[PDB]
Amino acid sequence: SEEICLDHLCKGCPLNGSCSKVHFHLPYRWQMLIGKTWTDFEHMETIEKGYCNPGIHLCSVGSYTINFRVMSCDSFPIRRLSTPSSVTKPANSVFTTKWIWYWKNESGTWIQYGENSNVDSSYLESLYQSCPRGVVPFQAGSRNYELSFQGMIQTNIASKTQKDVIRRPTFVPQWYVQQMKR
Numbered sequence: 001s002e003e004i005c006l007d008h009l010c011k012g013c014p015l016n017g018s019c020s021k022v023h024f025h026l027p028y029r030w031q032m033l034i035g036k037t038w039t040d041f042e043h044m045e046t047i048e049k050g051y052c053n054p055g056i057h058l059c060s061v062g063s064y065t066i067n068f069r070v071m072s073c074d075s076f077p078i079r080r081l082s083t084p085s086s087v088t089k090p091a092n093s094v095f096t097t098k099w100i101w102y103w104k105n106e107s108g109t110w111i112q113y114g115e116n117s118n119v120d121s122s123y124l125e126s127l128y129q130s131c132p133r134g135v136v137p138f139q140a141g142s143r144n145y146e147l148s149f150q151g152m153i154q155t156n157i158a159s160k161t162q163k164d165v166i167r168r169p170t171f172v173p174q175w176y177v178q179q180m181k182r
């Protein structure tokens, strides 16, 4: 499995070294595929900070430049292992990943859904987890839209104007993870 174990981050995984999930000390794990082995980046917190910002799709870390849109780093492919999405576990699970959904506005910036849309990040993330190929109808002001997950775009159904939609996690630094473990 490609999922980071929540029990290992919290009170402890009873499956010890036989767990089917990844055991890492952070809720995220950035890796680069070299040959046939995924290899940990050194400065994961910096990569994560760049990734979580919706207006940042480039991250120069070390010698290599990372492109989040393509999820590659100097040609070589990369990946971000994560803990389960927060909407799939109770609220007590503090180490789950909280995903924010943004749409890019006319002025060029990213706006969180709900900040006015009748859907929010919890709504969209839940729908996406239960169906990743769905289309979500929603309303904002007097306008109506369809949000396509598989295309990750919102479309006004009247004008057919399209706008980009992005899904990114909230950032947590390692020291705050330590605090959470206390």
Ligand SMILES: [Zn+2]
Pocket (backbone or CB within 6 Å): 005, 006, 007, 008, 013, 014, 015, 019, 020, 021, 022, 023
């Ligand atoms: Zn485990």
